[PDB]
Design a binder for these strands. Structure first.
Length: 1092
RNA sequence: ACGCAUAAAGAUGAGACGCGUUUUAGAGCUAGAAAUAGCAAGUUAAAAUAAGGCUAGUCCGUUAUCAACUUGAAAAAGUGGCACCGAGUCGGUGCUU
DNA sequence: CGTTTGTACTCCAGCGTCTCATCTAATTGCGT
DNA sequence: TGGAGTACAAACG
């Protein structure tokens, strides 16, 4: 018999339906097996799979990189301890050890409690003399006396461990923090160079530039307000180049500097400024201006006093906190004695004592303390500081995120240079320590694997271990840098194994220009004319017009080659460029000038050709750049056999374009078959979009194949799919390739099965036209009905009685039975919640390491179960230790399944069970389905919780009525329909009571939440008087009691009603467990009451 | 002015920064039998950031895939009759296994 | 009297900013 | 979101 399949793909559901030539759905008597006494069930060919949505890989990468950074930060300190290790034995042979025993409780320490000095008086003196680390950093920088080696190490480790951002290149001159006023010096120098004496207006201080939020709008407005400059060089158009990345990247200035580019004042600036060098300070002052605007912004100290600006800022940031605390204590105690014992003694409010010791941030502390400062007398300076957001600040606060590492380098350099003459091993290791601080792995070399990585691409110049001091002697940077881009670039589609040509490659240029000119006709343009036209026009003219100059040449005798011309300007040797014996040299150059960007690999690669052309040409070309990868490889256009490029260069009927030349002639048709070559699990990688659709496609294929398997393996006639978009074009190919695997008398496909695709406008119009209204809040049958209607409308459209069929449509929409299925799944993810709880005496705490007992150290909490196993055994009951037989359900967590699947018997024994019976172990994943009396179903959600399992089969008349009242005004859309709709809905009201009765009966049968039903009924009785719309708007909310899935709270007009949480897992240990196939038609029932 | 480089959505990979938690170290004092009472103080550091693994690397550990049962180490293959009259989570009648 | 267990009721969970590279695919400024 | 954890009072031996 003929039939068709309808489908409806989604992000969380896949409706499937089967219809014969008549639009009704067939039914069959499917067999069941197990230890039950049932043998058959009769089911309808309708269903709807449901599943959990997939997710993106981002959140895993964001932790993988963090794991790498934590694995490297320990190695840096390991190197530094190694350097000190030869001498530290003469001072404190255990210093590095107490620093590791520091974390753990006093009972488990092997050495003394005090980390630094190991005895009480010295530790107290140390904390008395240097209240923070910064008072030590500054002391070491500003001193000429021998420091103790422990202090030097402790200061150095702080900077090597915390080292600031690497985002600024070149040097920073520390004293430029003082010279922020040099705006007048800038305009002065601009006046000296531009002797026309531009405006020297000084009425606006640089302070307004530094203090403001100097966005482009603010920068421009403030700059133009202070200087209506007579030329752009004195205003924003140049000062942006002087203080920010250039928006005028081209034509940065027209008068000086060759009219050439500058971009963002990188380290490359020192050579990009050669345009100014060749034709000339206006451009020198930018350096000091930027240094000033940075340092004077971050540093609150004029550095003329000291070499260590940051240590000098933080001391003042500490002193003001002390001086304000001592004042505020006195004021609060004098004016409000009742608040003193709250603010300064609590640890729960947002007060000061709740800001140090609690978790309170700066923002909420100010929010709390503003009023007490405001209404009290004499606090004006505190109000000023608070409005500036500099009141009671901590040193290591959240906003240190902008300090650059040159400051740390400058401090460390002097720290070494003051002490090296007393401790010789520092003298010959300075270059090593400073290297440890500054060393960084380049972004294109990647992980330093040895072949085991799934990610790495690095290649080695030697088989040796990498350290900071010999990185470039072991990694071969050129090969890694090339592979970095070669890894990601895609392959040629026509022969899927060779790399693609760059867009600017010269062979590609010839190919394109020949393919263009061969189509010129007047009769096709013969070969000698090809040579003449190309040599005259395309090798001389920088933009040959499409039309005119060809006609000019024609009348004289009787789309661009850009890279050729750019090379012609870069190197003037005409016959060096225009020679075949140099084509394979220049092609490498055109590749290098697009494969690299860092201006070091280009030196690395071009250097072999330095003899072949003079210095100036080489230095000019080194700065050139190209970008873009094309479509075709070398093998497809040339080399493979005369080649195709030769045929294009030939004369006669070879003028046929590539796309036709390769296609018609067997001699060149041969390539497309000789290397023509794939399963779904890698074809799916070609699909664009998020994984959320890939999952739906994958499930849809399985559903289709298994439906075909059920139906006696006769192929379906038509398949209708639903989501001008590529994805729905790809899915059609995915289905039809598998379906039509059959070949005709010409060895090509036979269309056994047709694939069709629709758009939702038709089905929505059908809904509105024939009043098959959909309400999304009641039950999950809409997926199946949608799929069925898709199949109906698609088959009707492709075949093309409405006065006869609608009865069948009505009944199949009204059928009570629909094969809803939820996909079982083993859980994957993190072991437990991340928050490290404080120590508690409860035993739920999970140890954070092997030998850190949670009772003393705290730890994680609330782990997650992977799957649950039914176990039957004997357990030791009572003080008399009776080995009572027990049947029990146990949960296996993600952390444990590795051991469990390795050895179930010893794990179940370690749980405490004795004499467990092996073959009675069952695996029960999440969402396993159980059936109990009266059809009361429950799904497992964990070892100790359940979920509902039933669908409410509300009749069609009620959903039809509720549709006409869930929307009243917006639903109208037309007066002639509205009048009769209003006349209809008004003439009966008892349907509200019918809905209440239905919900009450269904809840009494299967939900068993009677208290909430009583509350609902009482509230409905209370509000019976309200108009019909007000009733309906919350009657729609009322079905949240009966819907499938985990229970959740909802609200009724004034009353919130809380969720009921089933927990009685014990009631299930004797229910009929159901195993289902994906479609749900094939079933297996295990009766747990026959076991144990 | 039709044109395409464009911004504005994503997908994937690599390189660095700033915080936040947890446990110790920073000798609280006085009057009282104690409970309690009065006052003083507060800003920093070390160690860990999925338990761990063997391939021993400056490497790997949260994405994707997964009813039963027979065979197969596994991949993988294979295993469940039809017509008719009716509907409250699917029934019944008939034929043939 | 002592124990297990059943219901109703809270309170809760790691986060923000940089640089670089490739791809797809639908969009618009105003190129002239 | 929806699941683990704490604190509370009644049925059963």
């Amino acid at each position: 018999k003929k039939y068709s399949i309808g489908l409806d793909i989604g992000t969380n559901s896949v409706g499937w339906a089967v219809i014969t030539d008549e639009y009704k759905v067939p039914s069959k008597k499917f067999k069941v097996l197990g230890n039950t006494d049932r043998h058959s069930i009769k089911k309808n060919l309708i269903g709807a799979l449901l599943f959990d949505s997939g997710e993106t890989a981002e959140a895993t990468r964001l932790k993988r990189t963090a794991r790498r950074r934590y694995t490297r930060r320990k190695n840096r300190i390991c190197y530094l301890q190694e350097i000190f290790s030869n001498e530290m034995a003469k001072v404190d042979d255990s210093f590095f050890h107490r620093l590791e025993e520091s974390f753990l409780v006093e009972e488990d320490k092997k050495h003394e409690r005090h980390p630094i000095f190991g005895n009480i008086v010295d530790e107290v003196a140390y904390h008395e003399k240097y209240p923070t680390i910064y008072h030590l950093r500054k002391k070491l920088v500003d001193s000429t006396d021998k420091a103790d080696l422990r202090l030097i190490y402790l200061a150095l480790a702080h900077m090597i461990k915390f080292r600031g951002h690497f985002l600024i290149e070149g040097d920073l001159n520390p004293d430029n923090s003082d010279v922020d006023k040099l705006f007048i010096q800038l305009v002065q120098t601009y006046n000296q160079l531009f002797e026309e004496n531009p405006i020297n207006a000084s009425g606006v201080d640089a302070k307004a530039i530094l203090s403001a939020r100097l966005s482009k709008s603010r920068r421009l407005e403030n700059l133009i307000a202070q200087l209506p400059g007579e030329k752009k060089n004195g205003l924003f158009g140049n000062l942006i180049a002087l203080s920010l990345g250039l928006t005028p990247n081209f034509k940065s200035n027209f008068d000086l500097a060759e009219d050439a580019k500058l971009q963002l004042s990188k380290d490359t600036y020192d050579d990009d400024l050669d345009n100014l060098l060749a034709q000339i300070d206006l451009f020198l002052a930018a350096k000091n201006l930027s240094d000033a605007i940075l340092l004077s912004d971050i540093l609150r100290v004029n550095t003329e006093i000291t070499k260590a600006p940051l240590s000098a800022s933080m001391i003042k940031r500490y002193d003001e906190h002390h001086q304000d605390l001592t004042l505020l204590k006195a004021l609060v105690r004098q004016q409000l004695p009742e608040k003193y014992k709250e603010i300064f003694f609590d640890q729960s409010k947002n007060g000061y004592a709740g800001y140090i010791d609690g978790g309170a941030s700066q923002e909420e502390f100010y929010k709390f303390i503003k009023p007490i400062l405001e209404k009290m007398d004499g606090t004006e300076e505190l109000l000023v500081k608070l409005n500036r957001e500099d009141l009671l600040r901590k040193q290591r606060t959240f906003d240190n995120g902008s300090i650059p590492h040159q400051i740390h380098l400058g401090e460390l350099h002097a720290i070494l240079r003051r002490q090296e003459d007393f401790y010789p091993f520092l003298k010959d290791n300075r270059e090593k320590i400073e290297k440890i601080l500054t060393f960084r792995i380049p972004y294109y070399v990647g992980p330093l694997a040895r072949g085991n990585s799934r990610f790495a691409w690095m290649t080695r110049k030697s088989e040796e271990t990498i350290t900071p001091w010999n990185f470039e002697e072991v990694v071969d940077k050129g090969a890694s840098a090339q592979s970095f881009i070669e890894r990601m670039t895609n392959f040629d589609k026509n022969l899927p194994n060779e790399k693609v040509l760059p867009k600017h490659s010269l062979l590609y240029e010839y190919f394109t220009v020949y393919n263009e000119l061969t189509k010129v006709k007047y009769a096709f343009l013969s070969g000698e004319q090809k040579k003449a036209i190309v040599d005259l026009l395309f090798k001389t003219n920088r933009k040959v017009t499409v039309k005119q100059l060809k006609e000019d040449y024609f009348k004289k005798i009787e789309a661009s080659l850009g890279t050729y011309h750019d090379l012609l300007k870069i190197i003037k040797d005409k016959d060096f460029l225009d020679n075949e014996e140099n084509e394979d040299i220049l092609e490498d150059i055109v590749l290098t000038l697009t494969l690299f960007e860092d201006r070091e690999m280009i030196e690395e690669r071009l250097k072999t050709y330095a003899h072949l052309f003079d210095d100036k040409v080489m230095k000019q070309l080194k700065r050139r750049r190209y970008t873009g990868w094309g479509r075709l490889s070398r093998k497809l256009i040339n080399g493979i056999r005369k080649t195709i490029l030769d045929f294009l260069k030939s004369d006669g009927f070879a003028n046929r374009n590539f796309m036709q030349l390769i296609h018609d002639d067997s001699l060149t048709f041969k390539e497309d078959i000789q290397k023509a070559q794939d399963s779904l699990h890698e074809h799916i990688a070609n699909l664009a979009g998020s994984p959320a659709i890939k999952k739906g496609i994958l499930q849809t294929v399985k559903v289709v194949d298994e439906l075909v398997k059920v139906m006696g393996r006769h192929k379906p006639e038509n398949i209708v799919i639903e989501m001008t978009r590529q994805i729905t074009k790809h899915v059609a190919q995915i289905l039809d390739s598998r379906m039509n695997t059959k070949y005709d008398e010409n060895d090509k496909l036979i269309r056994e099965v047709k694939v069709i695709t629709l758009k939702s406008k038709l089905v929505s119009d059908f809904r509105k036209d024939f009043q098959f209204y959909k309400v999304r809040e009641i039950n999950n049958y809409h997926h199946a009905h949608d799929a069925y209607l898709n199949a109906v409308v698609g088959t009707a459209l492709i075949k093309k009685d409405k006065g006869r069929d609608f009865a069948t449509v009505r009944k199949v929409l009204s059928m009570p039975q629909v094969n809803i299925v939820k996909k079982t799944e083993v859980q994957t993810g993190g072991f437990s919640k991340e928050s490290i709880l404080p120590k508690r005496n409860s035993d739920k705490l999970i140890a954070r390491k092997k030998d850190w007992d949670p009772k003393k150290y705290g730890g994680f909490d609330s782990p997650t179960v992977a799957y649950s196993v039914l176990v039957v055994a004997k357990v030791e009951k009572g003080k008399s230790k009776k080995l009572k037989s027990v049947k029990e359900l146990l949960g296996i967590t993600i952390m444990e399944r590795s051991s469990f699947e390795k050895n179930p018997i010893d794990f179940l024994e370690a749980k405490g069970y004795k004499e467990v019976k092996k073959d009675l172990i069952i695996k029960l994943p999440k969402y396993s389905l159980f059936e109990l009396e009266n059809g009361r179903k429950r799904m497992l959600a964990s070892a100790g919780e359940l979920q509902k399992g039933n669908e409410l089969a509300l009749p069609s008349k009620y959903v039809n009525f509720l549709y006409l009242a869930s929307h009243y005004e917006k639903l109208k859309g037309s007066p002639e329909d509205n009048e009769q709709k209003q006349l209809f809905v008004e003439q009966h009201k008892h349907y509200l009571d019918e809905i209440i009765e239905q919900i009450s009966e269904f809840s009494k049968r299967v939900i068993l939440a009677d208290a909430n039903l009583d509350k609902v009924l009482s509230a409905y009785n209370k509000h019976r008087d309200k108009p019909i719309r007000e009733q309906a708007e919350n009657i729609i909310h009322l079905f949240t009691l009966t819907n499938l899935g985990a229970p959740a709270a909802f609200k009724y007009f004034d009353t919130t009603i809380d969720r009921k949480r089933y927990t009685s897992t014990k009631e299930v240990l004797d229910a009929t467990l159901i195993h289902q196939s994906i479609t749900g038609l094939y079933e297996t029932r295990i009766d747990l009451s026959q076991l144990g």
